[PDB]
């Protein structure tokens, strides 16, 4: 019963090929190529989740279940980053043999394997409302889909391209927008698309650049690639899929630690930032200083807390060297404590110590006739 969320992209227009697959028509059906997948079982602590996930993603390759319900998806919006297209059951020995082969290596899944395994009880149920809306619109399940395919092709294609808006963009687009590194290309594509919204958490509201930065600081050990294939030597999806499936950031500890590390990093970062912004907002609200010195404080404080050196130390304090949460090498961050130690506690104190800190006084002592002299010389006459 292991459930897999899979993102695929055929050779050409994936929408037309997918619709033809749903209609069981042998006209256009490019073997489908899966490139990113999230496997989960209905349920947890952080280490309980890590053990469950490490069990899920078999280190040798593939998954560990006997029957697999796989929900294929495309880049689309319903704000969801993907959109499901068709769901397939895999209970027979031949079905799971094809799924393990296509999930651990990357060999495309032929139309036969999928077409013989559509969960018609649910597959055509996912897009049934789209069928109804198309019927109503053109007026002004699978037999209905075929009939609507025949009647007005242009509107069917336009509807299936507006929904699932991104569909297939380009092989090069994925290598462009999901980092040049293999770590990014596998892990960030898994999280930002098929793992962010499902698992919830703060990462659901974070952007692609932020998630790529988090992946960059997820610096797990890097073993060399057995075929020494470079990440930029990829042209079609048969290369990206092969790179991702036979990668060692995809079938084990790293694939299990990334979702937990996203949550951990954000929690540590917000703990320090939110503390620093509490201090910032309070001091801003109660400053009562001149306009120029106010701007000087606000810029100075934002620098003194969020300067490039302080930020570098903080990001090196959250960088991991292992995905196991109980064996993590991340250590407490010095950002807020250092910022409070130098700038903030001292400003809270000056809030008549302010005079002692900012007085630099020069009082020259003149005793004798020189006092009388200085008086008449520098004061209005008696």
């Amino acid at each position: 019963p292991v459930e897999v969320t899979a993102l695929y992209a055929t050779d050409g227009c994936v929408i037309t090929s997918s619709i033809a697959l749903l209609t069981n028509s042998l006209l256009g059906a490019e073997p489908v190529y899966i490139f990113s997948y999230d496997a989960y079982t209905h349920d947890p602590t952080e280490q309980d989740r890590f053990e469950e996930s490490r069990a899920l993603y078999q280190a040798s390759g593939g998954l560990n279940g006997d029957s697999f319900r796989v929900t294929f998806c495309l880049l689309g919006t319903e704000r969801g980053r993907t959109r499901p297209m068709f769901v397939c059951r895999f209970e027979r020995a031949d079905d799971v043999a094809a799924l393990q082969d296509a999930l651990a290596h990357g060999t495309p899944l032929q139309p036969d394997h999928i077409a013989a395994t559509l969960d018609a009880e649910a597959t055509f149920a996912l897009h049934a409302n789209m069928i109804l809306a198309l019927t109503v619109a053109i007026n002004n399940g699978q037999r209905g889909l075929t009939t609507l395919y025949v009647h007005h092709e242009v509107r069917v294609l336009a509807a299936y391209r507006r929904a699932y808006y991104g569909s297939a963009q380009s092989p090069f687009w994925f290598l462009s927008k999901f980092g040049p590194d293999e770590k990014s290309l596998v892990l960030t594509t898994r999280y930002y698309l098929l793992q962010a919204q499902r698992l919830g958490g703060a990462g659901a509201t974070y952007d692609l650049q932020a998630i790529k930065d988090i992946c960059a600081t997820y610096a797990i050990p890097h073993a060399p690639r057995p075929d020494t294939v470079s990440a930029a030597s990829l042209t079609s999806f048969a290369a990206i899929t092969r790179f991702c499936c036979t990668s060692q950031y995809a079938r084990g500890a790293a694939a299990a630690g990334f979702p937990l590390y996203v949550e951990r990093r954000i929690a540590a970062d917000v703990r320090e930032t939110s503390a620093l912004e509490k201090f910032i907002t309070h001091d801003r609200s109660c400053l009562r200083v001149s306009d120029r010195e106010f701007i000087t404080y606000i810029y100075l404080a934002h620098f003194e807390c969020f300067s490039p050196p302080r930020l570098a130390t903080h990001l090196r304090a959250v960088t991991t060297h292992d995905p196991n949460p109980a064996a993590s090498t991340e250590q407490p961050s010095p950002l807020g404590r250092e910022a409070v130690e130098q700038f903030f506690c001292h400003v809270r104190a000056q809030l008549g110590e302010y005079v002692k800190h900012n007085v630099t006084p020069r009082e020259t002592v003149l005793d004798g006739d020189t006092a009388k002299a200085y008086l008449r010389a520098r004061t209005y006459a008696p």
């Binding site: 880049l75 319903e78 704000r79 980053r81 409302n129 789209m130 109804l132 809306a133 198309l134 109503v136 619109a137 002004n140 509107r155 336009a158 509807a159 507006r162 929904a163 808006y165 991104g166 963009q169 927008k177 703060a202 509201t205 974070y206 952007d207 692609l208 650049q209 932020a210 930065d213 960059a216 970062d269 917000v270 930032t273 910032i280 907002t281 309070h282 801003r284 609200s285 400053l287 306009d291 120029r292 106010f294 701007i295 606000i298 810029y299 934002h302 969020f306 490039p308 930020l311 570098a312 990001l315």
Partner: protein, 719 residues
């Protein structure tokens, strides 16, 4: 990698506020009904128009240019439902560039397109009817009625066009069992305001206050006729206005039809309207709905950043600032002399000044015979009609007016103003060719050769070749066309591999295949080819085009006829293409365009691909008798030099190197701040005088408002 960190973790509170601002259901009675917009159509004058509140929300994202406000928009687009718009086409394309550089963003259009602005609305009397606000305190209803009376000649036309179009649409689907979410997909070409309630307007300070209400008003329109699911959910628009409040202004132009004196007054932009109006700052609750981005990234200079801080925040001008900006002052005759500061954009505070300087620059580049820019002459025409200037002269209460006196000022109001009043040109000579019932006029506009020019209006590029150096699916076809035009044996050893006495110069087959499959067959081949032979042995331009070109003088000899992008002026080939000849009034001038060969100017993009473009045609329709009729259509090229411009237009786009020419007496510190902030580095900045040392009219009213916003616990500051 650490640069994004502050934005990444500070945009989240912004995102966690826009969501509740967009998911707040209104009371049933407060929702503007369809009958409201039905009555608006019935109303003729904007006087009996009933006081009607149109609910809306705002979230203000403000800051210096280079703040990074674009990162906030990026995060919003990928997380929230939103319709991203722009105040100018350039700003919309800039946002598209910066949103498609991270993920997918649908084609970003202007807010004007979103609320239905069309061609005839461009020259419309937008300031006619009066209003004595029954106000102080000004009710929101009164403010909205003022902004609708301001735009009566636009709101009324939009309402009439939307209403009298008829009803199907969502009304149909909603009754599936009596699925509107899948309605915009199945029923296409539907307005984009029917699928979201978060409207992001970038550089919204370029829009006047009249637009704010207008947008909200229009929103409700497009959600009432179509009976959108958001209208059934009783949601209300939230306008995320992103822009710089102290580096951007909006101006209103009115043309008096007897004095022929086109005047341009200053106006209250959306940002200033929202920040400085006590009624809007309370209804919209700007305190809990304001984000100021505070960091200027492209500033590696401490003193320059300090100067930007004092100018933007209205801080007192001290002696030290005067001494710092003293190091930029260079004489008046040094900036204006074309021999100095080559490649530096020069800003003036008058369109006449730019028209003088460009002519002087052309004189310099012609007399000193600089082969870098072979100055050339190119025709631009105009087409007035006898009936138009007969009836309009009749209606202006003055039937005596010469055509040249008609073109005394309406030349600006006949096309894109920016280049129209900032171009050196000959006298627009006209003779009476009443063959197609027209008065034709013709002159020529002098450009420079091979300069980084910019496209002003919307043009249709037709790529003909690639004029780039050896360094380097239809794009793959064009690359195949390039290869079609593609030691002595050692690089030849790898050349014989391409072959499958230069080995490439022995035998060949047409480089560009026709079918896509054959193109891909020959694609990997040519891709590996250059990598191998060129590796051994790159500055000479690999000039390769689909057709042989001969640039005699400036016009090229392509035999076969068949805005943000920084293009390069190349030459005026004629090679009449039917692609640009989509001519269908317009046909009366189409016949003359067939008669007189229309020159198509050729431009070179950043990559180096040569592109032949179409011309531009624009109408003048304004009148006083409420009779908008097509008077005159102006056929010209619509290209800008990017070498000299006005300070006011400089607000829109950032510049590399800047020399500012300041006119004394007209010194406004906001103009100085805008002019000085267009360049990243203070090193490459020269100026006429010192704006800090001379008498300057400073208007520090919005500055204190930002300062009080920076002094509020509920305003989110992002570093």
């Amino acid at each position: 990698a650490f640069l994004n960190f502050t934005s990444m973790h500070g945009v989240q509170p912004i995102l966690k506020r826009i969501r509740e601002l967009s998911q707040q259901q209104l009371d049933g009675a407060q929702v503007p009904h369809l009958q409201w917009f039905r009555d608006v159509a019935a109303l003729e004058s904007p006087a009996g128009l009933p006081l009607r509140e149109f609910p809306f929300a705002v979230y203000l994202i403000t800051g210096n240019a280079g703040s990074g406000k674009s990162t906030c928009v990026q995060t919003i687009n990928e997380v929230l439902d939103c319709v991203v718009t722009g105040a100018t086409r350039i700003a919309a394309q800039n946002m598209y560039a910066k949103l498609s550089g991270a993920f997918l963003s649908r084609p970003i259009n202007t807010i004007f397109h979103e609320f239905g602005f069309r061609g005839n609305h461009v020259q419309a009397q937008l300031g006619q009817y009066p209003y004595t606000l029954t106000s102080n305190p000004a009710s929101l209803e009164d403010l909205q009625r003022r902004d609708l009376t301001y735009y009566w000649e636009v709101i009324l036309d939009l309402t009439k066009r939307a209403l009298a179009a008829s009803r199907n649409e969502f009304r149909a689907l909603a009754a599936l069992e009596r699925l509107t979410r899948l309605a915009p997909a199945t029923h296409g070409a539907l307005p984009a305001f029917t699928r979201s309630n978060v409207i992001v307007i970038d550089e919204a300070g370029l829009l006047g206050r009249h637009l704010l209400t207008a947008v909200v008003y229009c929103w409700w329109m497009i959600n009432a006729l179509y009976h959108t699911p958001q209208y059934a959910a009783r949601l209300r628009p939230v306008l995320v206005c992103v822009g710089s409040p102290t580096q951007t202004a909006s101006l209103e132009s009115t043309f008096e039809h007897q004095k022929l004196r086109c005047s341009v007054r200053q106006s209250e932009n959306v940002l200033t309207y929202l920040i400085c109006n006590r009624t809007l700052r309370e209804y919209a609750r700007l305190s809990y709905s304001w984000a100021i981005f505070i960091n200027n990234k492209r500033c590696v200079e401490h003193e320059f950043g300090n100067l930007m801080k004092v100018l933007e925040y209205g801080l007192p001008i001290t002696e030290e600032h005067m001494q710092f900006v003293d190091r930029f002052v260079v004489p008046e005759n040094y900036i204006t002399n074309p021999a100095n500061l080559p490649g530096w954009t020069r800003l003036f505070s008058s369109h006449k000044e730019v028209s003088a300087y460009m002519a002087k620059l052309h004189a310099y580049l012609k007399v000193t015979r600089e082969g870098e820019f072979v100055v050339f002459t190119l025709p631009v025409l105009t087409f007035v009609s006898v009936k138009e200037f007969d009836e309009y002269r009749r209606l202006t209460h003055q039937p005596g007016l010469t055509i040249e006196k008609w073109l005394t000022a309406n030349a600006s109001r006949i096309t894109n103003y920016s280049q129209s009043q900032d171009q050196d040109a000959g006298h627009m000579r006209c003779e009476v060719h009443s063959k197609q019932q027209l008065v034709v006029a013709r002159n020529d506009v002098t450009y420079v050769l091979n300069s980084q020019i910019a496209v002003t209006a919307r043009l249709r590029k037709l790529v003909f070749g690639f004029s780039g150096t050896f360094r380097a699916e239809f794009a793959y076809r064009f690359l195949s066309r390039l290869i079609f035009s593609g030691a002595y044996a050692r690089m030849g050893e790898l050349t014989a591999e391409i072959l499958s006495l230069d080995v490439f110069y022995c035998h060949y087959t047409p480089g560009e295949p026709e079918t896509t499959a054959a193109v891909h067959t020959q694609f990997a081949l040519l891709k590996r080819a250059f990598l191998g032979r060129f590796r051994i042995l790159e500055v000479a331009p690999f000039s390769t085009y689909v057709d042989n070109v001969i640039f005699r003088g400036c016009e090229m000899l392509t035999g076969s006829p068949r805005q943000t992008d920084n293009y390069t002026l190349m030459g005026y080939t004629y090679a009449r293409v039917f692609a640009f000849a989509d001519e269908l009034a317009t046909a009366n001038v189409a016949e003359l365009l067939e008669e007189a060969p229309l020159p198509y100017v050729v431009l070179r993009d950043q990559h180096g691909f040569m592109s032949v473009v179409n011309t531009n045609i624009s109408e003048f329709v304004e009148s006083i008798d409420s009779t908008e009729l097509a008077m005159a259509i102006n056929a010209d090229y619509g290209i800008s030099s990017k070498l000299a411009m006005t300070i006011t237009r400089s607000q829109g786009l950032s510049l590399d190197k800047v020399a500012i020419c300041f006119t004394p007496g007209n010194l406004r510190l906001n103009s100085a701040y805008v002019a000085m902030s267009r360049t990243t580095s203070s090193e490459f900045l020269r100026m006429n005088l010192n704006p800090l040392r001379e008498r300057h009219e400073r208007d520090d009213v919005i500055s204190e408002h930002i300062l009080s916003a920076l002094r509020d616990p509920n305003v989110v500051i992002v570093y």
